[PDB]
Scaffold this active site. Structure first.
Site, PDB file in Angstrom:
ATOM      1  N   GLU A  64     -18.924  98.772 -24.686  1.00 23.83           N
ATOM      2  CA  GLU A  64     -17.919  98.744 -25.738  1.00 23.83           C
ATOM      3  C   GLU A  64     -17.473 100.155 -26.090  1.00 23.83           C
ATOM      4  O   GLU A  64     -18.291 101.072 -26.205  1.00 23.83           O
ATOM      5  CB  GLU A  64     -18.450  98.063 -26.999  1.00 23.83           C
ATOM      6  CG  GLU A  64     -17.427  98.013 -28.136  1.00 23.83           C
ATOM      7  CD  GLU A  64     -17.958  97.352 -29.393  1.00 23.83           C
ATOM      8  OE1 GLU A  64     -19.173  97.075 -29.457  1.00 23.83           O
ATOM      9  OE2 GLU A  64     -17.160  97.118 -30.326  1.00 23.83           O
ATOM     10  N   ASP A  87     -28.041 110.074 -36.616  1.00 20.27           N
ATOM     11  CA  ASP A  87     -26.987 110.847 -37.267  1.00 20.27           C
ATOM     12  C   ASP A  87     -27.589 111.596 -38.443  1.00 20.27           C
ATOM     13  O   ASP A  87     -28.090 110.972 -39.383  1.00 20.27           O
ATOM     14  CB  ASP A  87     -25.851 109.938 -37.734  1.00 20.27           C
ATOM     15  CG  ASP A  87     -24.654 110.714 -38.250  1.00 20.27           C
ATOM     16  OD1 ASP A  87     -24.789 111.930 -38.498  1.00 20.27           O
ATOM     17  OD2 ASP A  87     -23.573 110.108 -38.407  1.00 20.27           O
ATOM     18  N   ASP A 137     -26.499 114.247 -41.358  1.00 27.14           N
ATOM     19  CA  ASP A 137     -25.262 114.626 -42.025  1.00 27.14           C
ATOM     20  C   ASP A 137     -25.581 115.525 -43.207  1.00 27.14           C
ATOM     21  O   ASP A 137     -26.378 115.154 -44.075  1.00 27.14           O
ATOM     22  CB  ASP A 137     -24.494 113.391 -42.504  1.00 27.14           C
ATOM     23  CG  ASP A 137     -23.349 113.015 -41.582  1.00 27.14           C
ATOM     24  OD1 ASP A 137     -22.747 113.923 -40.972  1.00 27.14           O
ATOM     25  OD2 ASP A 137     -23.052 111.809 -41.467  1.00 27.14           O
TER      26      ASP A 137
END
Ligand SMILES: [Zn+2]
Ligand SMILES: [Zn+2]
Ligand SMILES: [Zn+2]
Lengths: 381, 431, 182, 249
Positions: A41, A106, A108
Site C-alpha cells: 500500500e 516515530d 517527534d
C-alpha cells in the site's frame, strides 16, 4: 524557501532526483516473496490536501509513471496486504488483511515540549537536537542487542524528529500484539500533560534501563547542565524540585540560592539525594524524564499505519527526508539537510547518475549501503 | 423312493471342450495349491458386525460404485466430459448413471429411469425413453454411459448405449507351468431330498468323489436349507447347528480317502448361518488336525486361485435374480453373464431380490471382481449349462437335488497356460 | 411395547403360546412361562421341546433380520405415503428425498432401532436374573430362588445365549470412534 | 504393554490433538463420558469455592482425580499397563465430551474453562524433567541455557528476574525462548531479552502453554460443531451427548 515554489520544483525532483531504483530494491526485498511489491500500500497527498490510499503498482515503471503523473506533495508507505490494494473493492469483505510491514518508530520533538526550554511547538535549534541524538542511540542499541534486529534505517522526518524502519524479515512478520509488546518494552516515560512524575523505577533496575541510563549519562552534562540549563532560575528548577520528595525540597532551595552554575546545582542535588536509600534512583528518574525518548504506541502498534516515505519533501521546511548514518550520527545537522529548492538549483547548473552531482549523494549512498546489507542478508540466508 | 430308483445315474447331460474318456481321474490333491486370489483388496474371512446400516452410508457406497466404474469406462472410451443427468440438453451429451425402475414392480421398457452419481448429477434421476435406441440390454443397478438428448428437461432420450468393458484376465506366473491338469468337482445345495434329512445325494456325491479322486471339491450351500419343508414347520428333533455339524463331518470324513481339497461356500438359505451378504465363512466347525490343510471355509462370493487358475464362485442365484429384471431389445443367460462380468461385481443388481440381505459396506469391500475369472461357478434354479462368455467358462451345475428327484453336479479340468484354453474340458453330469 | 412377542405352537395340542415375560402368574403360583402350556387341558411342557423352541427362536431372528435388510422406505408425508425399496441418491438435509412428490423425506419402515429393540426384547423374555431382580416381587422371588426350578433356569440361560450371540454380532454394542471423530 | 498397547500415550499431559481411532463399547463410552463429566464438575465447583493456587484446591482435586481414576501424577517407572489404561480413558473421554460440549457457545466456553483449569493443575504437578519431556513431545521447543553462558550474563539475569538471590540464582537454570512467545513477560519488562531471545526461569511458562492449548481447543470445538450432523443420526449417543450438560452425577 518559498512554499508557493513547491508546485514548480516537485516534478523536476520526481523526474530526475527521487532514487526510484533503490526505492524499488527496498520495497521489493529481492523478489523472494511473490506479489510482495505488488501488494504494498502507498498513499499520496496532492495539492489542496487531497488524500488517496489503496494505491498499488505492478513494478518500478508503473510507479515512476503514476508518481510523475500525480506529483504528490506527500508519499506514505503502508502495509503489504493479502491482495493488491488497487483492487480492494474486488476482495470479499474480511478477506482484505494487512499481513506484513516494517516495524516503525516515530520520535517527534513536539512530544518533548513540557521538558525543553530553548524552543516550543515546531521550533528546533542546535541546543535541543541532542535529544534526538540520544534517542537514536538509546533505541537503536536496544533494537540491535535486545531484539536482534539487524537491518535498521533511520530517517530524518523533515522537521520535528526522526523515524526508524526496522526491516528484518522477522520484524516484518510480527503480529499486532508482538508490535505492542515491543513498543511497551522500549517505553519508559509514561503519562500525559496532567502528570508531573512520569518515571517511577522499581528498586531493581532492569538491564535495559541501566544501559539506557548509561547512554544518557554520556550526554546529560552537555545537554541538560550546559545547553538546556534546566537549573538556570527558580521558574525552571522549581519543576525538578517538584519531581523529588518534599522532605528535602527546602534543604535544596537554600542550596540553590548559593549556587552560581547549574552544574554546581546538579552536584548539590546529587549529594543531597545520596545523603537522604530507596530514593537513590531519583536522579535517574529525573534524567530519564528529561532525556528518554517518548514513543506513540499507536504509531507502532497498528499494521495498517501509513508513515512518511524516505526521500519525501517536507511541505513546509522543504528539507528531504534523508537517511541518517548511525556512525556519523554525532555530525548530523537537521539544518544542513538539502532542501528541494537547493537541489533543483544544483540540478539546473550542469542519466542515472544526475543525483551524484547534487548534495543528495551521500544520503543516497547511506541508503545504498543499507540496501546492500539487506541483500547480503537475503543471499547468505 | 423316487431318488433311490433313478435310472439315469452318471449320464452326461452337458459337455464342453476336449473329449475325455468315460472315466475321469484326478491327482487326489497331490500337486495342488489352493488359495484365495491375492488382489489389492483383503478377502472376507471373518464375521463383520451388521444390522446397522446408515442411509448415508448406502448412498455413499452406491455413489462411489457408479463413480468408480464410470471413471474406468471414461478412461477406456476416451470420453471428454460427463454431464448432469437432470439438466436439459438440446444437443447430444454423454451421461453416466445407473438404471432403475420408476415403480416397485419389474422393470419394463417404459419404466426405466437413470440415476446419476453425486459428483456429476447430485444424485438426481431422469426418466429414460428407449424409442431411439436400436439395441440395448438393461437391468436395475447397471452402471451405464449413454449419449443422448434431453430437450424437455424431463425425459432423457438415449441414442447410444456404450458397451461394457470386462476386466482383463489373469496373467499366471510360471511357478505353476509344470503342474499337471487339475480336476474339480462342483456341486450346489440342496443336498437332501425335499422329504428327507438323511443327505442321500450327498452320500452319492461323496462316493463319486472317492471314486474319481478329484483335486478340488467345491460345495456350495445351502447345507441345511431354510426352505426345507421339515425346517419351516419345526419337525426337527435336533438343533440346526447339530444337523449342520453332522453334514460337515460326513463331508470331511467321507472324503478322507480321496485326499481332495474341499472348498465350502455358504448360502443365504443356510438356516444356521448369519443371513447377510457378502456372507462370512462358516466358523462353527473345527476340522481335525488331519483335515485342516484340506478344508477351506471361504466367503460368498469367492475368488479362488488353483495353481494359477482363477475360479469365481457364488452361491447366490444371480441368473434367477437378474432374469426377472433384465429387459432387452431382442441367449438371455449369456447376456446376463456378460453383464455380471462387465459390471465387475458379483452382485450388480440394485435393489436386490427379495431373498437376499445385502450389507452395502461389506458389498463394496468384498464383491468387486478382481479379474475376469477363468471359470465362473454360478449355480441356479435355471437349467444347467456350460457357456463361454467373453472367454470365461461359466458353469451352472444345477443343484444336486431338484425337489424329490436327484439333480446334477459338474466336473471340469483346469490347467494354467493351456493352449486361452485354461478350461480343457467340462461336463454337467447326473448324480 | 411395539415389539412382537414370542409365539410358539405347542407340539402336542397345537395351541399358540405367547411369551412376553420370563415368569407367568402371581405369588406362589408363579412359574417360568415355558413350564406349562397355555391350554389347561394340555399337560405338555414346552420346556420339554426346548430344541423346537431354539429352532423357532432362530427362525424368528432370521425373519426380523430379513425385515430389516428389506430396506423398505415410506414417505413421511401423509398425502404421499410412497412406499419404495429403492433408496435414491438425492438427499436433503433430513435424508432421502421422496421421488414421488420430491418434497418429503423417506423414512425406514423398519429402522435399526426397531430390530435392536426386538432382539433386546427376545433377550428380556429369557433373562432369568433380570426378571428375578426387577420384575419379580419379594415373596415371588423367594419362591423362584429355590430348587425345582434349576433345570428351567439352565434352559432359560441356554435360550438367552442364542439372543446374546446374535446381539454380539450387531453394530447397533460397538461404537466406531473413527466415524465420529474425523 | 501387555497385549494391545503402544507408544500412543507417551506423557500424562497432552494437548488432545489426534482423535482416537479405536472401536470401543457402548458401556465404555458411557462410563468414560460420565466420569469425565464428574471430573469437570468437580473442577468447576472447587474453582468457585477455593482459590486455584490454594492448597485446599490441590488436595481436593487430587482426591477427585484418584476417586475417578484419571492420570494426575507422573511415574518414573515405565508405561505400566494400568497407567496406559488410565491415559486411554483420559484421551477418549475428552473427545467424547467435545462431542457433548460443542453445540452452543455457552457450553463451549464452559468446557474450555474447565479443561484449562484441569490442565493447569496437572502442569503444576510436573517435575522439571517431566516438564521438559512434555515440551519436547509437542514440538514446543522451549529451552536450556548453558552454565557458561549463564555466568556470562550473570548480572543481567540477576537484575532480570524479580526477587532472585545470588546463591539461589546460582541454583536455578533458565530457558531461551523467542520473544514472540513471552509477550506477557516482555511487555512489563520482567524478563531479560538478548539477541531476540528471552531468558525465562523455571511459574509463567504454564501461562504460555495454556495460551497455546486454549487456541487449539477453541479451533477443535469449532470443527466439532461443524461436524455435528454426522453424530445426531446415531440414536444410541443422542440421549447422552444432547443432555450430558444436564446429567445428574
Ligand atoms: Zn531548541
Ligand atoms: Zn399344549
Ligand atoms: Zn413422497
Amino acid at each position: 524557501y518559498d512554499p508557493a515554489s513547491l508546485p514548480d520544483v516537485l516534478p523536476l525532483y520526481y523526474r530526475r532526483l527521487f532514487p526510484f531504483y533503490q526505492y524499488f530494491r527496498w520495497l521489493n526485498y529481492g523478489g523472494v516473496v511473490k506479489n510482495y511489491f505488488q501488494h504494498r500500500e502507498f498513499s499520496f497527498t496532492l495539492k489542496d490536501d487531497v488524500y488517496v490510499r489503496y494505491q498499488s503498482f505492478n513494478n518500478q515503471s508503473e510507479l515512476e509513471k503514476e508518481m510523475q503523473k500525480m506529483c504528490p506533495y506527500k508519499i506514505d508507505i503502508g502495509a503489504v496486504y493479502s491482495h493488491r490494494p488497487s483492487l480492494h473493492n474486488t476482495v470479499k469483505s474480511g478477506t482484505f488483511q494487512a499481513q506484513e510491514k516494517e516495524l516503525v518508530f516515530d520520535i517527534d520533538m513536539t512530544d518533548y515540549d513540557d521538558v525543553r526550554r530553548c524552543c516550543s511547538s515546531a521550533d528546533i535549534c542546535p541546543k535541543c537536537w541532542t535529544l534526538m541524538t540520544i534517542a537514536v542511540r538509546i533505541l537503536d542499541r536496544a533494537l540491535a542487542e535486545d531484539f536482534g534486529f539487524k537491518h535498521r534505517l533511520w530517517v530524518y522526518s523533515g522537521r520535528r524528529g526522526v523515524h526508524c524502519w526496522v526491516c528484518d524479515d522477522s520484524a516484518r512478520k510480527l503480529s499486532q500484539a508482538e508490535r505492542s509488546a515491543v513498543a511497551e518494552y522500549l517505553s519508559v516515560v509514561k503519562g500525559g500533560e496532567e502528570t508531573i512524575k512520569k518515571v517511577q523505577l522499581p528498586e531493581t533496575i532492569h538491564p535495559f534501563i541501566g544501559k539506557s541510563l548509561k547512554m544518557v549519562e554520556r550526554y546529560f552534562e552537555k545537554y541538560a547542565l550546559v545547553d538546556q540549563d534546566i537549573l538556570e532560575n527558580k521558574q525552571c528548577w522549581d519543576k525538578v524540585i517538584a519531581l523529588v520528595p518534599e522532605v528535602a525540597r527546602e534543604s535544596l532551595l537554600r542550596e540553590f540560592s548559593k549556587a552560581r552554575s547549574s552544574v554546581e546545582r546538579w552536584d548539590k542535588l546529587s549529594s543531597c539525594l545520596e545523603a537522604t536509600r530507596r530514593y537513590s534512583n531519583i536522579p535517574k528518574e529525573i534524567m530519564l524524564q528529561f532525556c528518554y525518548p517518548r514513543l506513540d504506541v499507536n504509531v507502532s502498534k497498528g499494521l495498517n499505519h501509513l508513515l512518511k516515505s524516505p526521500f519525501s519533501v517536507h511541505p513546509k521546511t522543504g528539507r528531504i527526508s534523508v537517511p541518517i548514518d548511525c556512525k556519523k550520527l554525532d555530525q548530523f545537522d537537521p539544518f544542513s539537510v538539502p532542501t528541494i529548492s537547493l537541489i533543483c538549483s544544483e540540478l539546473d547548473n550542469v542519466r542515472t547518475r544526475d543525483y551524484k552531482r547534487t548534495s543528495l549523494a551521500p544520503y543516497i549512498k547511506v541508503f545504498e549501503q543499507f540496501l546492500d546489507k539487506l541483500d547480503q542478508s537475503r543471499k547468505g540466508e | 423312493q423316487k431318488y433311490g430308483s433313478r435310472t439315469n445315474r452318471g449320464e452326461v447331460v452337458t459337455t464342453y471342450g476336449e473329449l475325455q474318456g468315460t472315466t475321469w481321474n484326478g491327482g487326489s490333491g497331490s500337486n495342488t495349491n489352493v488359495e484365495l486370489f491375492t488382489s489389492l483388496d483383503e478377502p472376507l474371512t471373518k464375521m463383520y458386525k451388521f444390522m446397522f446400516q446408515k442411509l448415508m452410508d448406502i448412498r455413499e457406497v452406491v455413489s462411489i460404485k457408479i463413480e468408480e466404474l464410470g471413471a474406468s469406462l471414461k478412461d477406456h472410451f476416451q470420453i471428454d466430459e460427463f454431464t448432469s443427468v437432470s439438466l436439459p440438453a438440446q444437443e447430444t451429451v454423454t451421461v453416466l448413471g445407473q438404471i432403475g425402475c420408476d415403480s416397485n414392480g419389474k422393470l419394463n421398457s417404459k419404466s426405466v429411469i437413470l440415476e446419476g452419481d453425486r459428483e456429476h448429477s447430485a444424485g438426481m434421476q431422469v426418466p429414460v425413453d428407449l424409442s431411439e435406441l436400436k439395441d440395448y440390454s438393461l437391468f436395475p443397478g447397471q452402471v451405464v454411459i449413454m449419449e443422448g438428448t434431453n430437450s424437455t428437461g424431463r425425459r432423457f432420450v438415449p441414442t447410444k448405449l456404450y458397451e461394457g468393458v470386462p476386466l482383463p484376465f489373469h496373467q499366471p506366473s510360471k511357478e505353476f507351468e509344470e503342474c499337471p491338469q487339475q480336476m474339480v468337482i462342483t456341486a450346489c445345495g440342496p443336498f437332501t431330498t425335499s422329504d428327507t434329512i438323511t443327505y442321500d445325494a450327498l452320500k452319492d456325491l461323496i462316493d463319486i468323489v472317492n471314486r474319481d479322486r478329484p483335486d478340488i471339491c467345491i460345495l456350495l450351500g445351502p447345507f441345511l436349507d431354510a426352505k426345507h419343508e421339515q425346517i419351516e414347520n419345526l419337525q426337527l428333533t435336533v438343533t440346526f447347528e447339530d444337523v449342520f455339524k453332522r453334514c460337515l463331518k460326513m463331508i470331511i470324513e467321507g472324503t478322507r480317502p480321496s485326499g481332495c481339497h474341499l472348498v465350502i461356500v455358504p448360502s443365504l438359505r443356510d438356516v444356521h448361518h448369519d443371513p447377510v451378504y457378502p456372507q462370512p465363512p462358516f466358523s462353527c466347525f473345527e476340522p481335525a488336525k488331519e483335515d485342516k490343510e484340506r478344508v477351506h471355509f471361504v466367503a460368498d462370493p469367492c475368488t479362488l486361485s488353483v495353481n494359477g487358475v482363477v475360479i469365481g464362485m457364488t452361491s447366490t442365484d444371480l441368473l434367477f435374480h437378474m432374469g426377472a429384471e433384465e429387459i432387452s431389445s431382442s441367449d438371455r443367460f449369456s447376456r446376463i453373464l456378460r453383464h455380471i462380468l462387465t459390471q465387475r461385481s458379483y452382485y450388480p443388481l440394485y435393489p436386490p431380490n427379495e431373498e437376499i440381505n445385502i450389507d452395502y459396506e461389506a458389498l463394496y469391500s468384498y464383491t468387486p471382481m478382481p479379474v475376469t475369472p477363468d471359470v465362473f461357478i454360478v449355480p441356479s434354479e435355471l437349467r444347467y449349462f456350460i457357456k463361454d462368455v467373453t472367454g470365461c467358462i461359466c458353469i451352472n451345475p444345477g443343484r444336486l437335488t431338484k425337489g424329490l428327484v436327484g439333480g446334477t453336479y459338474a466336473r471340469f479340468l483346469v490347467k494354467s497356460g493351456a493352449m486361452r484354453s485354461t478350461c480343457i474340458s467340462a461336463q454337467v453330469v447326473r448324480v | 411395547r411395539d415389539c412382537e412377542r414370542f409365539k410358539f405352537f405347542c407340539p402336542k395340542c397345537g395351541t399358540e403360546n405367547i411369551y412376553d415375560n420370563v415368569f407367568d402368574g402371581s405369588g406362589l403360583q408363579i412359574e417360568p412361562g415355558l413350564k406349562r402350556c397355555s391350554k389347561p387341558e394340555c399337560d405338555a411342557s414346552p420346556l420339554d421341546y426346548v430344541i423346537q423352541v431354539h429352532n423357532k427362536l432362530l427362525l424368528d431372528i432370521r425373519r426380523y433380520i430379513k425385515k430389516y435388510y428389506s430396506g423398505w422406505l415410506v414417505c413421511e408425508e401423509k398425502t404421499c405415503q410412497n412406499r419404495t425399496r429403492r433408496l435414491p441418491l438425492s438427499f436433503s438435509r433430513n435424508g432421502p428425498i421422496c421421488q414421488a412428490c420430491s418434497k418429503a423425506t423417506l423414512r425406514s419402515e423398519y429402522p435399526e432401532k426397531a430390530l435392536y429393540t426386538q432382539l433386546c426384547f427376545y433377550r428380556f423374555i429369557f433373562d432369568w436374573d433380570y426378571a428375578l431382580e426387577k420384575v419379580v416381587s419379594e415373596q415371588e422371588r423367594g419362591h423362584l430362588k429355590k430348587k425345582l426350578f434349576q433345570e428351567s433356569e439352565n434352559q432359560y440361560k441356554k435360550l438367552k445365549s442364542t439372543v446374546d450371540q446374535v446381539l454380539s454380532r450387531s453394530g447397533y454394542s460397538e461404537v466406531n470412534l473413527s466415524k465420529l471423530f474425523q | 504393554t501387555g497385549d494391545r498397547k503402544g507408544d500412543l500415550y507417551p506423557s500424562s499431559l497432552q494437548f488432545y490433538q489426534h482423535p482416537p481411532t479405536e472401536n470401543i463399547s457402548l458401556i465404555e463410552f458411557e462410563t468414560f463420558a460420565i466420569e469425565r463429566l464428574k471430573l469437570l464438575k468437580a473442577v468447576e465447583n472447587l474453582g468457585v469455592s477455593y482459590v486455584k493456587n490454594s492448597e485446599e484446591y490441590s488436595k481436593k482435586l487430587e482426591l477427585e482425580l484418584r476417586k475417578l481414576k484419571f492420570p494426575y501424577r507422573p511415574l518414573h517407572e515405565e508405561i505400566s499397563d494400568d497407567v496406559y489404561d488410565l491415559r486411554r480413558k483420559d484421551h477418549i473421554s475428552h473427545f467424547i465430551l467435545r462431542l457433548a460440549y460443542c453445540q452452543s457457545e455457552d457450553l463451549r466456553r464452559w468446557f474450555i474453562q474447565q479443561e484449562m483449569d484441569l490442565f493447569k493443575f496437572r502442569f503444576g504437578l510436573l517435575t522439571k524433567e517431566s516438564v521438559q519431556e512434555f515440551l519436547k513431545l509437542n514440538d514446543l521447543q522451549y529451552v536450556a541455557i548453558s552454565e557458561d553462558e549463564k555466568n556470562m550474563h550473570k548480572e543481567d539475569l540477576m537484575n532480570s528476574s524479580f526477587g532472585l538471590s545470588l546463591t539461589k540464582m546460582e541454583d536455578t537454570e533458565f530457558y531461551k525462548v523467542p520473544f514472540q512467545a513471552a509477550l506477557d513477560l516482555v511487555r512489563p519488562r520482567k524478563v531479560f531479552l538478548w539477541r531476540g531471545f528471552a531468558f525465562i526461569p523455571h511459574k509463567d511458562i504454564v501461562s504460555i502453554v495454556l495460551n497455546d492449548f486454549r487456541a487449539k481447543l477453541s479451533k477443535a470445538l469449532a470443527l466439532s460443531a461443524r461436524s455435528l450432523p454426522v453424530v445426531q443420526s446415531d440414536e444410541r449417543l443422542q440421549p447422552l451427548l444432547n443432555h450430558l450438560s444436564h446429567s445428574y452425577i
